[model samples]
Target: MTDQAFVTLTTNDAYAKGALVLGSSLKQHRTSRRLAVLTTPQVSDTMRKALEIVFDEVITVDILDSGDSAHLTLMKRPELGVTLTKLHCWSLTQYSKCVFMDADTLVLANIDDLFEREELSAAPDPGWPDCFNSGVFVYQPSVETYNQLLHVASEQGSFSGGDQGLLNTFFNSWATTDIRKHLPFIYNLSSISIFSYLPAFKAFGANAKVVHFLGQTKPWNYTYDTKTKSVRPQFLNVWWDIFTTSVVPLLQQFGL
Candidate 1:
């Protein structure tokens, strides 16, 4: 529906590349829903324009850091700056609903069915199955929710210093409330699982619809070995393929 969209955020140029590949992949899978991206000023104009080409809406958003000094000092997790910025997704009230996917994630198949899930529906994190990973989730946008989230961020602060912790805290009943809200792990498969749970991965990996590059090292960090015609960790190869075939040409045209 035009009222729903697949949303992502890019705080910098590097993540913009990931977003481009992600948007391309979404289009490749032919999603009927619109594609939108939330970007910070750190992304260059050229990169922003590149994103505009792939995404139907390239909306720029400011960094909404959890500026509570006490919280930052006590937590000692400066990365929460960007984590707070992710809260802007709630302010995208143009769409009645949105599926927020981290830029580091790649779509492997048509997942339009995700729209059927209710707000706060998401897959569980690999590290702690109890907490749903914030990398991919379905949500309803509301100004009230956005203000409440900011209030929570300023007052209690996030326990894990990231969106996952904050979101899990707000949607406290996710783990026990309803089975329908628990998205299958295949929807947000983490790349680390290939090694962490090789046996399970081998059995179920083929059904993966999304791959989350949930670490400091992203797909753009790896150089595709043209000589061998591949990238290590295998899944990254798909990211590189889209980057080369779709995103690279757009960047080249802009003389970036």
Candidate 2:
């Protein structure tokens, strides 16, 4: 059994598509670690089967919504439902260490070197440099840590109504404690930055190891142009290419 792994979470079919491509991309780049994906019941059986083909382990996890009424009363954020679901990543004790990447993220290059880092190591969010984006992170799986995170989620609730805020609050020392814990921005490059900071993107974009499709619109949401052989954002073409070439055939075989 491999001691290290790459993990991702998906709650629905749309995100399942993203997970499939992400897994395929990881395999394409030849990661040495095992691949695992946490899927909720909302994901279709066909999609789960597709995921099984791409991932070494496809685990079905129950939805863990932060439903504390008092806490909800203090912060009426319904989106925290998914934040708790994401906490399931910490429960993967089967693997001693795992790099948890959001399904919305795509790997541009082999990043197995991330295993060399310690738990909670992540790149800073483009929106807030002080807060590390939860899109990609290196973590050690532990039952105790999982329970503690759950306690934090229910007790305080996430300030940003998402996992990023809750994780930042729980791993508050990330900003100042150790410089090594702070990963370079290329590890989790925000796609919006391509437009927000064009010059910077031109200077350092070539070094990007992972691209995060932040904001509401994901890569799957865009329509690929077969005639032009590309997608609108251009960076998304790779995702679509994997989806059509690698994932679509499996789904078709499943009669989906």
Candidate 3:
């Protein structure tokens, strides 16, 4: 079993809150695996200190000092710019295998089995069915692979216009490669609503092990009504349910 896993988030304090909940949720589930979080130097000391108590390793990474100059130049590009920094997971050579978890994602179940999947395996993106969502992935760390990824960014450029862009370039064959390599959506379930795929989400929403709060508004940023949208794909309420669900396993069982 891989002893270590990597995760990262943006510099925002709210994102730090999300990361705390994320790390706490993982620990609550009793992962038995070592947890590591990669953050930038810009992250506040309070946030770093809070993270240190939960994560086995809390380290700093400077996004500007990365190898992907072309993509690094594209750093000022998206709302999820921190995801660009997330690629540092590859440089974490101390772990032979690592899974990159987004701060916005809450782990509801034990997903340590994910490391058993082949390298570069990821769940398909909800927006674009062809490409896998890069918010979560299983990868090996090596300077050579890191350099090759930079080469792709410096050369043909990213196709999807984000980490998914460069990730797709590296895992070029995920679309039609080995069927087993394609992860089911429950692994990194997106929180966004979808009309085209309503029925499918209805059947599987409660079963999802990972909830990804993608986009500008995070779950911690909203209030849930609980009457609607929790089991469905509505972003607001699902997050509330997820937060509550993530904490249930951590409760000390002080009965009323």
Candidate 4:
């Protein structure tokens, strides 16, 4: 309900954990903006309550039907339930502007300055150059835009049956119009992308401010070795570090 906020969505218990870590990391970096989480009924009451202690608000939202199940099947993705649920983020009109970070993201640095950017500001998706990743984006909450998005979604569905495809089509101009809207890749760096261009990643990996856990394997799926206090795939160690240390104590506060 603040003028600006950092928002995220979680439809089930799995993502709720990620959202908690995301919220914890945001607080860890000491952001000035308010933090909020949008969740669907699929999330258990226990996890929902656990989230309330960490975020400014835990808004319950309904799952949206993206009508892209067939498309997603071809694309080799999981169901679109959570993907469509992500659309609910646009209806959060309480905040004037917001940064909708995917629950799988972890903040490494203070990024309160992102609010200074305009609506639709985001980093390019590592998969494609023209389409910006929907993981981390700055947007203004508007009923008009929200309704329009639903209309388009109903009419065309999403190319990939996910918010990313729908948002990319709606914000089509982002690819060619203004360069300032293109946030530096560091802000939405995906952990898997590091290996794609290891040389470039090594050159700048230290500067990543927002680390994204993209692909099927998530930080929650991996077992954390407390003895060594580390995990595989290397990139996840940072996420595990925050989850085990700072986030665990916070969850204990709620008896989760």
lDDT of each: 0.86, 0.86, 0.71, 0.82
The residue ranges of model 2 lying beyond 4 angstroms of the native Cα positions read: 64-78
What does candidate 4's lDDT look like per residue over 10-125, in tens digits? 97888888998899899889898899899887888767887888799898775433343223332334455565567667778899999999999989899988988898999999
Q: What ranges in model 1 sit over 4 Å off?
A: 64-79
- In model 2, what are the clashing residue pairs, if there are any? none
Q: After superposing candidate 4, which stretches have Cα over 4 Å from the reference?
A: 64-80, 232-234, 250-256
Tens digit of per-residue lDDT, candidate 3, span 1-256: 5556756564666676677777877777778677888877777766677677768888776756655442454454543355456666777788888878888887878888887887788899987878998888888877788777756665655676667888897898999998777777888888773335678877877788887887767767665555763542344454455455543333322232
Q: What does candidate 2 score on TM?
A: 0.93
Give lDDT: candidate 3, residue 35. Answer: 84
Ranking according to TM-score, highest score first: 2, 1, 4, 3
The 10-residue segment of model 1 with minimum total lDDT is 65-74
Task: Show where candidate 3 strays beyond 4 Å.
Answer: 65-83, 193-196, 223-256
- What are the per-residue Cα lDDT tens digits for candidate 1 across 1-256? 9989999999999999999999999999999999999898899988898998999998877654344322343244446667666877888899998999999999999999999999989998898899999899999988888778766776667888778888999988899888888999999999999668899998999899999997768899887975676885768988998888899899888873
Candidate 1, residue 178: Cα displacement in angstroms equals 1.0
Better lDDT candidate (2, 4): 2
lDDT of 1 at 77: 42
